[PDB]
Enzyme design. Structure first.
Site, PDB file in Angstrom:
ATOM      1  N   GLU A  75     -79.705  58.295 -55.134  1.00 24.39           N
ATOM      2  CA  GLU A  75     -79.446  59.415 -54.250  1.00 24.39           C
ATOM      3  C   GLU A  75     -78.565  58.894 -53.095  1.00 24.39           C
ATOM      4  O   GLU A  75     -78.843  57.967 -52.379  1.00 24.39           O
ATOM      5  CB  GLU A  75     -80.723  60.026 -53.715  1.00 24.39           C
ATOM      6  CG  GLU A  75     -80.631  61.394 -53.073  1.00 24.39           C
ATOM      7  CD  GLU A  75     -79.885  61.471 -51.767  1.00 24.39           C
ATOM      8  OE1 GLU A  75     -79.068  62.347 -51.433  1.00 24.39           O
ATOM      9  OE2 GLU A  75     -80.024  60.363 -51.117  1.00 24.39           O
ATOM     10  N   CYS A 108     -84.172  65.061 -48.189  1.00 27.03           N
ATOM     11  CA  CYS A 108     -83.985  64.579 -49.529  1.00 27.03           C
ATOM     12  C   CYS A 108     -84.635  65.490 -50.581  1.00 27.03           C
ATOM     13  O   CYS A 108     -85.806  65.864 -50.446  1.00 27.03           O
ATOM     14  CB  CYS A 108     -84.578  63.189 -49.664  1.00 27.03           C
ATOM     15  SG  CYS A 108     -84.136  62.434 -51.307  1.00 27.03           S
ATOM     16  N   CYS A 119     -86.702  62.830 -53.499  1.00 34.81           N
ATOM     17  CA  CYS A 119     -88.054  62.706 -52.988  1.00 34.81           C
ATOM     18  C   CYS A 119     -88.392  63.996 -52.230  1.00 34.81           C
ATOM     19  O   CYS A 119     -88.820  64.026 -51.092  1.00 34.81           O
ATOM     20  CB  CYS A 119     -88.261  61.436 -52.183  1.00 34.81           C
ATOM     21  SG  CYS A 119     -87.363  61.321 -50.633  1.00 34.81           S
ATOM     22  N   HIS A 139     -91.154  64.666 -47.477  1.00 33.50           N
ATOM     23  CA  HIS A 139     -90.880  64.818 -46.048  1.00 33.50           C
ATOM     24  C   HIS A 139     -91.574  66.041 -45.456  1.00 33.50           C
ATOM     25  O   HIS A 139     -91.952  66.028 -44.285  1.00 33.50           O
ATOM     26  CB  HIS A 139     -89.374  64.863 -45.714  1.00 33.50           C
ATOM     27  CG  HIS A 139     -88.685  63.571 -45.974  1.00 33.50           C
ATOM     28  ND1 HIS A 139     -88.661  62.564 -45.021  1.00 33.50           N
ATOM     29  CD2 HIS A 139     -88.018  63.097 -47.058  1.00 33.50           C
ATOM     30  CE1 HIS A 139     -87.983  61.525 -45.514  1.00 33.50           C
ATOM     31  NE2 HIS A 139     -87.585  61.836 -46.761  1.00 33.50           N
ATOM     32  N   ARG A 153     -90.608  55.635 -52.881  1.00 35.33           N
ATOM     33  CA  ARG A 153     -89.815  54.469 -52.471  1.00 35.33           C
ATOM     34  C   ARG A 153     -90.439  53.666 -51.345  1.00 35.33           C
ATOM     35  O   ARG A 153     -89.922  52.654 -50.876  1.00 35.33           O
ATOM     36  CB  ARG A 153     -88.422  54.955 -52.089  1.00 35.33           C
ATOM     37  CG  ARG A 153     -87.630  55.425 -53.326  1.00 35.33           C
ATOM     38  CD  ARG A 153     -86.444  56.351 -52.973  1.00 35.33           C
ATOM     39  NE  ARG A 153     -85.942  56.852 -54.244  1.00 35.33           N
ATOM     40  CZ  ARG A 153     -86.536  57.812 -54.938  1.00 35.33           C
ATOM     41  NH1 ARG A 153     -87.639  58.447 -54.484  1.00 35.33           N
ATOM     42  NH2 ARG A 153     -86.030  58.192 -56.098  1.00 35.33           N
ATOM     43  N   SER A 212     -86.230  53.974 -47.603  1.00 34.56           N
ATOM     44  CA  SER A 212     -84.937  53.319 -47.841  1.00 34.56           C
ATOM     45  C   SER A 212     -84.288  52.791 -46.559  1.00 34.56           C
ATOM     46  O   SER A 212     -83.408  51.931 -46.664  1.00 34.56           O
ATOM     47  CB  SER A 212     -83.979  54.259 -48.566  1.00 34.56           C
ATOM     48  OG  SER A 212     -84.349  54.530 -49.890  1.00 34.56           O
ATOM     49  N   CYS A 262     -82.220  55.622 -51.676  1.00 34.46           N
ATOM     50  CA  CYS A 262     -82.038  57.003 -51.291  1.00 34.46           C
ATOM     51  C   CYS A 262     -81.363  57.047 -49.928  1.00 34.46           C
ATOM     52  O   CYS A 262     -82.023  56.778 -48.934  1.00 34.46           O
ATOM     53  CB  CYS A 262     -83.402  57.721 -51.349  1.00 34.46           C
ATOM     54  SG  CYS A 262     -83.148  59.492 -50.991  1.00 34.46           S
ATOM     55  N   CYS A 307     -82.307  60.040 -47.520  1.00 31.17           N
ATOM     56  CA  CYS A 307     -83.548  59.568 -46.916  1.00 31.17           C
ATOM     57  C   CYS A 307     -83.306  58.534 -45.837  1.00 31.17           C
ATOM     58  O   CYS A 307     -83.802  58.594 -44.712  1.00 31.17           O
ATOM     59  CB  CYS A 307     -84.423  58.902 -47.999  1.00 31.17           C
ATOM     60  SG  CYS A 307     -85.561  60.142 -48.698  1.00 31.17           S
TER      61      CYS A 307
END
Ligand code: SF4
Ligand code: SF4
Ligand code: F3S
Ligand SMILES: [Mg+2]
Lengths: 534, 267
Positions: free
Chosen positions: A16, A63, A66, A70, A461, A484, A528, A531
């Protein structure tokens, strides 16, 4: 015969977001690395002054890979700030949707983002489908026949001879590549399963929409709990359960065996991509206010000293900007965070990324499945220990093999397997609680004029945290510190390489024009960048 | 990547969260494998393509310069502040990439509210000067079909592509350039809770027995009455949609919805 000079990979695809990786190669091995994130959106700036209830709708859009994570982190954060203790069923439903997110995410990552680093799809055309079926049937309780694999081969043959290679255009394996090792039959099995996973992930994602309205970007969380009364019904629970059961079968019968076959063929990859330090926040709580109530517990490890796991102290997080495109050089704890963009172009004033550089007690920390797995193992987690040990025994390697690109890839599989089973446990507890006559899913709460809150999620992640400062009942500061960001952000003001940067040192590169070895390591962290930078 | 037989699609990622890309992977009847192997030739797509770096840039060039022509599908807003510096791919600004490629497309589809209208990063105070494709590139005569939503229903992308391929033209579009075949009704006029709305039967809180009973979410902020989308009809993932999950519509297929529809829990 070996290359000295720079290699730039921009864009890094099959992640991503927008990543530029720069390396210096000496004698065919990487000697230096830079992780450059090249898109900024500024969601933290946008959130200022807004209603804290609205934060989760904005930050979910950090994101869509994922997705939900969030929304969950912001809702945990504002729940915490307002001091609400959500009902048991809200915890169960939130936890179940998160477990489903992990399964969807990790299956897509292995097949659709990572596997083209290891699988030569066009060599699948020269495979013997009968031999391939025998191999596929040896590694899984699922029976595969020659006709099954021929159907795949027939379909690929037609696609390739059209000359329109589409997503396989200019692949690093086209025409052969010395760092691609699989025989044609194994390439055919992996390719068959890649295609199969494209449809299976539809069901894995659907499991999240059963309770969570839709995927991507769920819409069932609120401060105080969840909204989905229909999630209490036996019909929705049954629909969820059937999708989970099919998804878990795919994890158990297709992903993990494939993971093991590829890892066995690439055992040299235990020698590259290691890191020193690990952080994890724990996940799937019984008590929203106690990280140590989570099925996976938080922890910190320095220098691979797993015998001395340290407790996670949230006050020891600082985000650096000296090598990032923000004002100045001062690291900040996220409750005192700053997001003040200042671009200097690549390496302008030694700055090269839109990500901040989070450090824990000043150290760069890997987060993600390899951190969650190793720390859980080391805490005596029995499910993690049984699966990890069986993977190590199947591969014929020692625990030290885990500190590598191959190890990280295997850890993502271990975690998928363990979470897939645990979802059934959570589901049964959920069912049991309903059967006691608890039908409550949301609790009342009140907005304080002044407060601080933090939400912790261990995302696919790694450790995700959202931090709010409420002032006059509005968002005075909102800071995201994302997995990330930890793993792929740049150097800090002590010039310490980030996990991905450091992991890249020592990478061999057989062909600088087709540097698949750099992609293997970078993809093993499952980057990501949306992210990471937000 | 391409040539004749299947129509070439170039899929670009600007300032985006990749949720629109993920929504296409949820494609159902047809599924994404049918779409990529049979219907279309997906010739550039950073999320799933094998090539990276120079090899990926070469695949993009090959696709865009094809004598056979291509369709562009664009995800994400275009950051325009500070001469486009806030978003780069291969060290080129997104503004420049899109300014060069989109005028060469036979058709352009802006997919997701970010690409159609600017989206989440264009919300106040818009630090990166993010704009929707048609706004950013008006000067170049770019007129993308806008398929809005955050992310949109992938049924609406596939239906639009199929229409285009069959009819060699855009379908009827509304004044926001969205296809009226999908965006012609408010969410609200299609909602199962509309009888409670008509009766003044509103949930006063998410914990209330009225919410448990499925009363209207308007008092809790629902933007269904001012949002155009086909969510209650098509649903998502063949199974649900926000109001049926008990949460108000946040208006996500409308321009500037992050600022127009907020606070999300007020009407
Ligand atoms: S429209 Fe929404 S889902 Fe799509 S890229 Fe933008 S923020 Fe993500
Ligand atoms: S819940 Fe929303 S879309 Fe449904 S009737 Fe009420 S206001 Fe309309
Ligand atoms: S929030 Fe978006 S997905 Fe549909 S129900 Fe409202 S237009
Ligand atoms: Mg941040």
């Amino acid at each position: 015969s070996s290359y000295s000079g720079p290699i730039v990979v921009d864009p890094v695809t099959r992640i991503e977001g927008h990543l530029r990786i720069e390396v210096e190669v000496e004698n065919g091995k990487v000697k230096n690395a830079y992780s450059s994130s090249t898109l900024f959106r500024g969601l933290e700036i946008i959130l200022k002054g807004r209603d804290p209830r609205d934060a989760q709708h904005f930050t979910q859009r950090t994101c869509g890979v994922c997705t939900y994570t969030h929304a969950l982190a912001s809702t945990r954060c504002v729940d915490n700030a307002v001091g609400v203790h959500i009902p048991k069923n809200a915890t169960y439903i939130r936890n179940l949707v998160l477990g489903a997110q992990y399964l969807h995410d990790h299956i897509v990552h292995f097949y659709h983002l990572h596997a083209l680093d290891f699988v030569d799809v066009t060599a699948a055309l020269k495979a013997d489908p009968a031999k391939a079926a025998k191999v596929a049937s040896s590694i899984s309780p699922r029976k595969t026949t020659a006709a099954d694999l021929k159907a795949v081969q027939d379909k690929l043959k037609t696609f390739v001879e059209t000359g329109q290679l589409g997503p396989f255009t200019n692949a690093y394996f086209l025409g052969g590549h010395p760092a691609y090792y699989l025989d044609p039959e194994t390439n055919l099995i992996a390719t068959a399963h890649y295609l199969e996973a494209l449809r299976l992930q539809v069901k894995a994602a659907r499991a999240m929409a059963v309770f969570g309205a839709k995927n991507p970007h769920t819409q069932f969380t609120v401060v105080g709990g969840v909204t989905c009364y229909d999630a209490l019904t036996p019909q929705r629970i049954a629909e969820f359960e059937a999708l989970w059961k099919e998804t878990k079968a795919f994890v158990d019968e297709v992903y993990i065996p494939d993971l093991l076959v590829v890892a066995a063929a690439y055992k040299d990859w235990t020698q590259y991509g290691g890191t020193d330090n690990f952080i994890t926040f724990g996940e799937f709580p019984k008590d929203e206010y106690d990280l140590n109530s989570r099925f996976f517990k938080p922890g910190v490890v320095f220098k691979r000293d797993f015998k001395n796991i340290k407790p996670f102290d949230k006050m020891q997080i600082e985000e650096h900007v000296r090598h990032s495109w923000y004002e100045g050089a001062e690291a900040r704890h996220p409750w005192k965070g700053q997001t003040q963009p200042k671009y200097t172009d690549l390496h302008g004033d030694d700055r090269y990324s839109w990500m901040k550089a989070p450090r824990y007690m000043g150290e760069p920390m890997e987060t993600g499945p390899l951190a969650q797995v190793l720390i859980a193992y080391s805490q005596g987690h029995p499910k993690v220990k049984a699966v990890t040990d069986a993977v190590l025994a199947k591969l014929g390697v020692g625990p030290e093999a885990l500190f590598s690109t191959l190890g990280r890839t295997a850890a993502r599989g271990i975690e998928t397997a363990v979470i897939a089973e645990y979802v059934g446990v959570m589901l049964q507890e959920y069912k049991d609680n309903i059967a006691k006559g608890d039908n409550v899913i949301c609790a009342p709460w009140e907005m304080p004029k002044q407060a601080e809150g933090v939400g912790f999620v261990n995302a696919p992640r790694g450790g995700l945290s959202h931090w709010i400062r409420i002032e006059d009942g509005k968002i005075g500061n909102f800071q995201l510190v994302v997995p990330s960001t930890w793993t792929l952000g740049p150097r800090c003001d002590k010039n310490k390489l980030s996990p991905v940067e450091a992991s890249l040192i020592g990478t061999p590169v057989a062909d600088a024009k087709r540097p698949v070895e750099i992609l293997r390591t970078v993809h093993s962290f499952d980057p990501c960048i949306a992210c990471g930078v937000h | 990547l391409m040539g004749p037989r299947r129509p070439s699609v170039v899929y670009l990622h600007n300032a985006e969260c990749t949720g629109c890309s993920e929504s296409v992977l949820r494609a159902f009847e047809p599924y994404i494998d049918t779409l990529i192997l049979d219907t279309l030739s997906l010739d550039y797509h950073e999320t799933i393509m094998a090539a990276a770096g120079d090899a990926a840039e070469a695949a993009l060039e090959q696709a865009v310069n094809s004598p056979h022509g291509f369709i562009a599908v664009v995800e994400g807003g275009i950051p325009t502040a500070a001469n486009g510096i806030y978003g780069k791919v291969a060290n080129h600004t997104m503004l420049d990439i899109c300014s060069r490629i989109l005028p060469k497309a036979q058709a352009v589809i802006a997919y997701g509210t970010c690409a159609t209208f600017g989206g989440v990063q264009a919300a106040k105070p818009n630090p990166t000067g993010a704009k929707g494709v048609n706004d950013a590139l008006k000067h170049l005569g770019v007129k993308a079909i806008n398929i809005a939503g955050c992310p949109p229903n992938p049924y609406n992308l596939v239906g639009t592509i199929v229409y285009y391929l069959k009819n060699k033209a855009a379908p009827e579009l509304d004044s926001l350039n969205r296809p009226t075949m999908f965006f012609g009704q408010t969410v609200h006029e299609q909602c199962p809770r509309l009888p409670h709305f008509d009766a003044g039967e509103f949930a006063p809180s998410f914990e209330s027995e009225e919410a448990r009973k499925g009363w209207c979410l308007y008092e809790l902020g629902c933007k269904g009455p001012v949002t155009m989308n086909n969510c209650p009809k098509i649903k998502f993932n063949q199974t649900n949609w926000p109001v049926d999950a008990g949460h108000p519509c946040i208006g996500c297929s409308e321009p500037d919805f992050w600022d127009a529809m907020t606070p999300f829990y007020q009407n």
